[PDB]
Amino acid sequence: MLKIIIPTTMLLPMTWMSKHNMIWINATVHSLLISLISLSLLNQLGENSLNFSLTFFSDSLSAPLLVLTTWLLPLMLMASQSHLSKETTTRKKLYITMLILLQLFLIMTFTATELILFYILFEATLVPTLIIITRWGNQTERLNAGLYFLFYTLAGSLPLLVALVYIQNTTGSLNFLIIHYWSHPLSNSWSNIFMWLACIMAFMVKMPLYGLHLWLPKAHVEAPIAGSMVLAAVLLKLGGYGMMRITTILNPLTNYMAYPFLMLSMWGMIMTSSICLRQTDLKSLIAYSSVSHMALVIVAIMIQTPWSFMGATALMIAHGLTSSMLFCLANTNYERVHSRTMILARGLQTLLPLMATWWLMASLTNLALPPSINLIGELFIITASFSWSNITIILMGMNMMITALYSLYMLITTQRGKYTHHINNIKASFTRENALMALHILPLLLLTLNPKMILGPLY
Amino acid sequence: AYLTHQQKVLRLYKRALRHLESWCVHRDKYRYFACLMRARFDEHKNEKDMVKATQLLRQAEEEFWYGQHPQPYIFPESPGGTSYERYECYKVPEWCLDDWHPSEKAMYPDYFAKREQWKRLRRESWEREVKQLQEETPPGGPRTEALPPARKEGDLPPLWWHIVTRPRERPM
Amino acid sequence: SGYTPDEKLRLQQLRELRRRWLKDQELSPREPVLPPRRVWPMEQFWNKFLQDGAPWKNVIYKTYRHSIFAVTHVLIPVWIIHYYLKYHVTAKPYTVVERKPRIFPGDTILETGEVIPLMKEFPDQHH
């Protein structure tokens, strides 16, 4: 994996050593180049992970996720030079440094072979995200959000720490390979249940799971645009990635100790999507939508079913691409009107003709319209859950009904309708905004042709 | 501010006939029943006592509510009509034209130059029109939403740009 | 009752300005002005061809515009589809499956030249 980590690390001096106004260009072009090298790993061998060394390994689970992060890196960079341009050279240089330190930790996390090495970088993503949210966040409540974000995931991660070290002293090794081959049946002793709770709660908090989900509406609403997407597009998936990886030793205790989470998730999706049916703030609307889609993956993972797992990873990446995109949609309109309220800016299709389209198939992809991989993800989970229980469809099917009503609702209120009379500062959309939207839509629909590169190891 | 008794009963008259359109349909039936409505409205002119008039219209509104047509004939270019706000997704406001591009701007030089003429006139008329507004403003804030007209010569009436330069009802 | 003197004067100037404003919304004869566009050999050919405008000039005009539509929208698309269906996708088993050729008692079949027997003696009823 050093063909990716090393250029990413060497890009850190690259930005700092750059000139005054060339930082955006060099960082963008090389990050895009880093993305291209990441695509070299999409080929996964028959039934073996592409084990490179003891330090780093990759399989069909992290292969799509890794290139999603590298592909993301230009997109935050392409979404940041609007509000950041009115700042000193150092602070802009610092901002780029953080995201690159962010992706570097993310790249190391997905490729880590050892659960402890997984663990260290998995919490380490807090440090750059926390400062990004707090420093450049354009709001007042962000100060409370940083505390809410940091403690909430840490409050679950710290009990996780004691779980891994216990496994190391008891079972022996702790890497992703030996655990799978030396997996032993977990008993029903009450101590095993608490270890199950410790080994699981840390991952559910970052998903999030309904109830333990209040840190998204705080963080996402007033996070900076660049930090908003990564936290929405991968950092939620980071909690997801550990769910497949760590549920190799928690069998068969998963069958009995999952009912509270399934009930919390299968009911939370209806409740959280019911949140989305009415939101005064567009960004809050998108953040809660991420809760519902992620709650689908929690159901997907907890069943622990072949079909369920492939649907989980397919939805996991697909949601990240569209959720990041919709956040870019919010940033554009919020930039023109300098506010976040729904009804303030309306009838924007007439004023901006192309953005009417960009927000349109963004909503369709959010709607899991077939064959968009959002559908191939959600539909797989329904089939797996229905096999698990025939009444799952009543709830999870009703989600697609509720998901439709709010998804178009933001399309109806903002894009369609009559133009706002007093608003007159909306200029023609710059080609940067239009291009950035295409950098999200095109890979999504392009990847629809070959879902086998997103269906994960269980494919 | 206050729809007086005469204003309300005329409003009752206008709405009553419009509903009776949907009922009578055919014109010959219309001209008869409208005349009864007219004749039976003329009879209570010497009612004198205003209290009776409220009682005379008390049963009238509910009687209209009794015989109101569930599908009244509402006019297409009106609220509730089929062609209501339909021809609106094309009337982009005037101020959007300022954000045009010079290549686009050079396409229509004469109109753009004349628009600049209207642009300057609004700039010159603003100070006079805002000054005129406050010089005869009523005490304790504006009491009536009606705005003063242009009193002297040359000066344009205050708050005119959006009314005058409103998009046409048939922009296409 | 009845625009008030100030109000009727207000609507008068409002009407006057509105009329003049909509008058500016007219178009001069020169507008719209536009830079020229790279001409095409076929287009200019049909312009000089159609100067006569005779009825027999129009049919070949319409026939040709129907002809090049057929070749570039049916002839080529049916070519690549047939080639795909004849040498790429049918080269895999069970890709194009069709209902069995429905034969009837009495006729004959091709691949062996055998005759399915004639329908035997009917109970011979009539209406």
Partner: peptide, 12 residues
């Protein structure tokens, strides 16, 4: 009679 039509700039 032809008359001006307002349209948001699509050149960008």
């Amino acid at each position: 009679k032809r008359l001006f039509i307002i349209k948001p700039s699509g050149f960008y």
